[PDB]
């Protein structure tokens, strides 16, 4: 059997017991709120990870690219939301997916994008399902939640244009700037209220709006109530990461994704251990640098997964990571503690960024064996 | 003409590719290749390009055709790929892990002249014991710390150099040389500081080789390099080869260091405008950090380019517009100066294609399964590159 001692390094390891606990926690919270969970698979892009989310009770998926829609559809998943403002040039790709049987949903936030979809759908005989993206927190895309004229103009373009106006959605991504339950709870309420208000405005205009979809992992876990909401979209929670830990929604011990690395040398005067997990393994994401505890390029754990507080990757080049004390001191006799060849596991800043560096995950079972779970790269 | 007509009908250009896409401007890439090879020829040293920037067979083929001698790789997966493609002279320039010794042995047994590096007595002892067990005289170079960038034996640490060189030589391995990488050059931004660092890198690696040879140990190769010190060195006496890699494409970190212009940057990411926030002066593009990478190396340099410098479809810089933010599949295009551009939707209409110059070519390239190699006629060809280990 393949195990953490036999793998080459670096490797992206999923602790299956931790991932299942994360999947159960999120599904149980959504069940308590009376809403569907539509996981965002862009975090893993791996068929077996999404299958475990579905087995726990998830309803459909959210994807960040049409490549992910192709992969998951080829795997038998048909209820797919492509939650990135639709580019008109990708309409042939989307059409071919729907004609093949994939119930692929698109989103827009502009009259011009809604007109491009509706005109192509009429030409091709396709009533595209399209949701309107709502900006509830100023994070990124979307129709402002009280910009009613814009909301109604896009709504009538789709519905009068013969398309299926399927719903409204929002992602309150500014939740990643927060770090207290009170602030997260308030942002989750602003997200819920803004999305519900857009749905209510459509409906008062006699336009259909059957789905109201909100979510980010921190607002999904913090929201006190979700009246008016039909589903929540959350993705990074499947593994968690150190950014989530700093936001306050999980502990380091809950993070299910780590990078297995080998010690390949040392700088004794500086108290460095050099590992073979550089930024090509961890990614360049440094999201914890802007937070109350900086973890460098990741938190060190031993081969058993025990967190080693106070050792982090303080630097990284492409294929070399620099392990050193978080307090800045030069650990004495670093080589005596971490001899050449010692294996360690590094928890990521951002699970979605680190996962994308690997062709595959190594799914670690209770007995210590691993199975390789491929994931998708590119577009 | 059946093949001809069908190929024409299938041929992509920058208007027909899906976005995002990593586009190599071949004419800029050839100018970078010629420039570095001519500089190394002028210095009388070999150029051993570091292929970890592209990990692409046709890009390394163009470096070889121009005059390069061998390659440097950052992983044994690169050594496996490039050897399969016919490159036999390969330096694996990352401190050797003992557990990878079976793979290095297999590659040498298949005919790859694969060189390994160490910087410790324990790594030397592991290589020599495995080589004696397996009947293999591994070739091993000793890595030298000349500028404090990362790791390596100190150039002035004679006792440790000798201990490692003797462990290898007495152990029946081939002690083949010393190498250094003065990566602290990426913190510099004047020709004077770069020329002085290049001289410190040359002097320190030659110093180490001279200490080994003074002890009777072989050390025929002296290998130095980073792209900025390769381009800045006045003299390379005592050096046998230079390793450089990011030069093949350049990037905005190199532009800021001062060793190229933005117009020399051969790699760009083709993106489409997919939305706006008109009141904030934002255009939203489909190149987020999954396309650009999270690399922000320009953040602390003289000119911060955010997640990349915006260029028009013809690849010309659009001054003052950069990607100021990025989420996974969304980039935020806005003024670098922090003004909200008026009429952003007029400046950048929905569906507009743009090209984004990267902070760090090695980091952006690794986000793509393949490059789109752009010829002067506007045609592109898919050039696969390696992902993972
Ligand atoms: C449109 C949309 N919906 C849901 C999610 C899931 O959010 P998480 O559960 O918090 O992962 C996202 C996530 N988007 C990413 C991104 O990079 O775009 C986050 O904003 C982030 O990691 O910063 C989403 O876009
Ligand atoms: C051992 C070794 N040799 C040569 C090079 C090539 O340097 P460039 O020509 O400047 O790319 C490198 C490069 N190493 C990278 C890295 O990430 O490790 C650079 O230090 C960097 O991009 O920061 C090298 O490691
Ligand atoms: Mg975000
Ligand atoms: Mg994320
Ligand atoms: Mg460096
Ligand atoms: Mg580089
Ligand atoms: Mg392998």
mmCIF file of N, CA and C in Angstrom, chain A residues 326-377:
data_model
loop_
_atom_site.group_PDB
_atom_site.id
_atom_site.type_symbol
_atom_site.label_atom_id
_atom_site.label_comp_id
_atom_site.label_asym_id
_atom_site.label_seq_id
_atom_site.Cartn_x
_atom_site.Cartn_y
_atom_site.Cartn_z
ATOM 1 N N UNK A 326 8.323 30.991 13.943
ATOM 2 C CA UNK A 326 7.440 32.129 13.748
ATOM 3 C C UNK A 326 7.902 33.301 14.589
ATOM 4 N N UNK A 327 8.583 33.072 15.752
ATOM 5 C CA UNK A 327 8.979 34.231 16.611
ATOM 6 C C UNK A 327 10.196 34.938 16.066
ATOM 7 N N UNK A 328 10.792 34.469 14.985
ATOM 8 C CA UNK A 328 11.869 35.278 14.377
ATOM 9 C C UNK A 328 13.223 34.819 14.843
ATOM 10 N N UNK A 329 13.296 33.980 15.892
ATOM 11 C CA UNK A 329 14.612 33.593 16.449
ATOM 12 C C UNK A 329 15.222 32.491 15.571
ATOM 13 N N UNK A 330 16.513 32.203 15.726
ATOM 14 C CA UNK A 330 17.160 31.158 14.986
ATOM 15 C C UNK A 330 17.159 29.906 15.890
ATOM 16 N N UNK A 331 16.270 28.948 15.617
ATOM 17 C CA UNK A 331 16.242 27.767 16.392
ATOM 18 C C UNK A 331 17.641 27.200 16.406
ATOM 19 N N UNK A 332 18.085 26.878 17.601
ATOM 20 C CA UNK A 332 19.403 26.275 17.799
ATOM 21 C C UNK A 332 19.366 24.841 17.270
ATOM 22 N N UNK A 333 20.452 24.427 16.635
ATOM 23 C CA UNK A 333 20.526 23.019 16.194
ATOM 24 C C UNK A 333 19.278 22.504 15.460
ATOM 25 N N UNK A 334 18.853 23.320 14.508
ATOM 26 C CA UNK A 334 17.626 22.986 13.724
ATOM 27 C C UNK A 334 17.712 21.574 13.114
ATOM 28 N N UNK A 335 18.890 21.172 12.671
ATOM 29 C CA UNK A 335 19.114 19.843 11.997
ATOM 30 C C UNK A 335 18.980 18.677 12.942
ATOM 31 N N UNK A 336 19.104 18.968 14.220
ATOM 32 C CA UNK A 336 18.982 17.898 15.170
ATOM 33 C C UNK A 336 17.526 17.571 15.389
ATOM 34 N N UNK A 337 16.681 18.597 15.334
ATOM 35 C CA UNK A 337 15.253 18.409 15.462
ATOM 36 C C UNK A 337 14.600 17.857 14.171
ATOM 37 N N UNK A 338 15.065 18.325 13.000
ATOM 38 C CA UNK A 338 14.454 17.960 11.745
ATOM 39 C C UNK A 338 15.565 17.406 10.832
ATOM 40 N N UNK A 339 16.034 16.159 11.096
ATOM 41 C CA UNK A 339 17.126 15.617 10.265
ATOM 42 C C UNK A 339 16.737 15.549 8.817
ATOM 43 N N UNK A 340 17.726 15.571 7.953
ATOM 44 C CA UNK A 340 17.537 15.343 6.490
ATOM 45 C C UNK A 340 16.545 14.187 6.293
ATOM 46 N N UNK A 341 15.550 14.385 5.421
ATOM 47 C CA UNK A 341 14.596 13.309 5.093
ATOM 48 C C UNK A 341 13.340 13.322 5.955
ATOM 49 N N UNK A 342 13.311 14.070 7.051
ATOM 50 C CA UNK A 342 12.137 14.073 7.905
ATOM 51 C C UNK A 342 10.929 14.583 7.059
ATOM 52 N N UNK A 343 9.767 13.978 7.270
ATOM 53 C CA UNK A 343 8.574 14.416 6.529
ATOM 54 C C UNK A 343 7.694 15.225 7.492
ATOM 55 N N UNK A 344 7.102 16.255 6.968
ATOM 56 C CA UNK A 344 6.246 17.179 7.712
ATOM 57 C C UNK A 344 4.999 17.422 6.842
ATOM 58 N N UNK A 345 3.985 18.058 7.434
ATOM 59 C CA UNK A 345 2.768 18.392 6.640
ATOM 60 C C UNK A 345 2.458 19.857 6.905
ATOM 61 N N UNK A 346 2.198 20.593 5.843
ATOM 62 C CA UNK A 346 2.013 22.034 5.915
ATOM 63 C C UNK A 346 0.563 22.407 5.654
ATOM 64 N N UNK A 347 -0.081 23.106 6.593
ATOM 65 C CA UNK A 347 -1.448 23.566 6.374
ATOM 66 C C UNK A 347 -1.418 24.886 5.541
ATOM 67 N N UNK A 348 -2.352 24.978 4.551
ATOM 68 C CA UNK A 348 -2.310 26.086 3.599
ATOM 69 C C UNK A 348 -2.969 27.353 4.133
ATOM 70 N N UNK A 349 -2.514 28.490 3.602
ATOM 71 C CA UNK A 349 -3.267 29.746 3.757
ATOM 72 C C UNK A 349 -4.678 29.589 3.173
ATOM 73 N N UNK A 350 -4.738 29.116 1.942
ATOM 74 C CA UNK A 350 -5.979 29.177 1.163
ATOM 75 C C UNK A 350 -6.117 27.828 0.464
ATOM 76 N N UNK A 351 -7.111 27.031 0.869
ATOM 77 C CA UNK A 351 -7.200 25.656 0.371
ATOM 78 C C UNK A 351 -7.397 25.646 -1.172
ATOM 79 N N UNK A 352 -8.203 26.583 -1.715
ATOM 80 C CA UNK A 352 -8.520 26.557 -3.136
ATOM 81 C C UNK A 352 -7.233 26.830 -3.937
ATOM 82 N N UNK A 353 -6.331 27.711 -3.412
ATOM 83 C CA UNK A 353 -5.124 28.094 -4.137
ATOM 84 C C UNK A 353 -4.091 26.935 -4.081
ATOM 85 N N UNK A 354 -3.916 26.386 -2.851
ATOM 86 C CA UNK A 354 -2.919 25.289 -2.737
ATOM 87 C C UNK A 354 -3.349 24.066 -3.559
ATOM 88 N N UNK A 355 -4.632 23.722 -3.501
ATOM 89 C CA UNK A 355 -5.147 22.499 -4.179
ATOM 90 C C UNK A 355 -4.853 22.616 -5.687
ATOM 91 N N UNK A 356 -5.018 23.823 -6.266
ATOM 92 C CA UNK A 356 -4.820 24.016 -7.698
ATOM 93 C C UNK A 356 -3.398 23.761 -8.194
ATOM 94 N N UNK A 357 -2.422 23.719 -7.257
ATOM 95 C CA UNK A 357 -1.044 23.415 -7.646
ATOM 96 C C UNK A 357 -0.796 21.935 -7.936
ATOM 97 N N UNK A 358 -1.782 21.057 -7.628
ATOM 98 C CA UNK A 358 -1.516 19.600 -7.701
ATOM 99 C C UNK A 358 -2.410 18.961 -8.746
ATOM 100 N N UNK A 359 -1.825 18.021 -9.507
ATOM 101 C CA UNK A 359 -2.662 17.201 -10.413
ATOM 102 C C UNK A 359 -3.702 16.374 -9.666
ATOM 103 N N UNK A 360 -3.453 16.055 -8.406
ATOM 104 C CA UNK A 360 -4.283 15.111 -7.684
ATOM 105 C C UNK A 360 -4.086 15.293 -6.207
ATOM 106 N N UNK A 361 -5.070 14.869 -5.411
ATOM 107 C CA UNK A 361 -4.955 14.708 -3.965
ATOM 108 C C UNK A 361 -4.620 13.278 -3.610
ATOM 109 N N UNK A 362 -4.017 13.103 -2.430
ATOM 110 C CA UNK A 362 -3.817 11.774 -1.853
ATOM 111 C C UNK A 362 -4.824 11.647 -0.708
ATOM 112 N N UNK A 363 -5.868 10.839 -0.907
ATOM 113 C CA UNK A 363 -6.944 10.738 0.101
ATOM 114 C C UNK A 363 -6.517 9.743 1.168
ATOM 115 N N UNK A 364 -6.273 10.202 2.422
ATOM 116 C CA UNK A 364 -5.694 9.400 3.486
ATOM 117 C C UNK A 364 -6.811 8.760 4.338
ATOM 118 N N UNK A 365 -6.808 7.420 4.394
ATOM 119 C CA UNK A 365 -7.772 6.619 5.131
ATOM 120 C C UNK A 365 -7.331 6.439 6.564
ATOM 121 N N UNK A 366 -8.237 5.884 7.369
ATOM 122 C CA UNK A 366 -7.942 5.624 8.769
ATOM 123 C C UNK A 366 -6.734 4.667 8.996
ATOM 124 N N UNK A 367 -6.535 3.739 8.082
ATOM 125 C CA UNK A 367 -5.483 2.734 8.244
ATOM 126 C C UNK A 367 -4.130 3.318 7.758
ATOM 127 N N UNK A 368 -4.102 4.597 7.293
ATOM 128 C CA UNK A 368 -2.798 5.185 6.909
ATOM 129 C C UNK A 368 -2.533 5.025 5.404
ATOM 130 N N UNK A 369 -3.351 4.239 4.681
ATOM 131 C CA UNK A 369 -3.149 4.149 3.239
ATOM 132 C C UNK A 369 -3.732 5.382 2.537
ATOM 133 N N UNK A 370 -3.278 5.594 1.318
ATOM 134 C CA UNK A 370 -3.814 6.694 0.474
ATOM 135 C C UNK A 370 -4.314 6.153 -0.867
ATOM 136 N N UNK A 371 -5.289 6.889 -1.418
ATOM 137 C CA UNK A 371 -5.786 6.637 -2.767
ATOM 138 C C UNK A 371 -5.613 7.970 -3.513
ATOM 139 N N UNK A 372 -5.176 7.931 -4.784
ATOM 140 C CA UNK A 372 -5.014 9.176 -5.533
ATOM 141 C C UNK A 372 -6.391 9.579 -6.090
ATOM 142 N N UNK A 373 -6.740 10.862 -5.817
ATOM 143 C CA UNK A 373 -8.031 11.459 -6.337
ATOM 144 C C UNK A 373 -7.624 12.621 -7.253
ATOM 145 N N UNK A 374 -7.706 12.416 -8.566
ATOM 146 C CA UNK A 374 -7.374 13.453 -9.556
ATOM 147 C C UNK A 374 -8.253 14.681 -9.375
ATOM 148 N N UNK A 375 -7.692 15.809 -9.779
ATOM 149 C CA UNK A 375 -8.473 17.058 -9.891
ATOM 150 C C UNK A 375 -8.173 17.767 -11.187
ATOM 151 N N UNK A 376 -8.997 18.776 -11.506
ATOM 152 C CA UNK A 376 -8.910 19.453 -12.802
ATOM 153 C C UNK A 376 -7.955 20.671 -12.710
ATOM 154 N N UNK A 377 -7.206 20.913 -13.798
ATOM 155 C CA UNK A 377 -6.344 22.062 -13.983
ATOM 156 C C UNK A 377 -6.731 22.717 -15.283
#
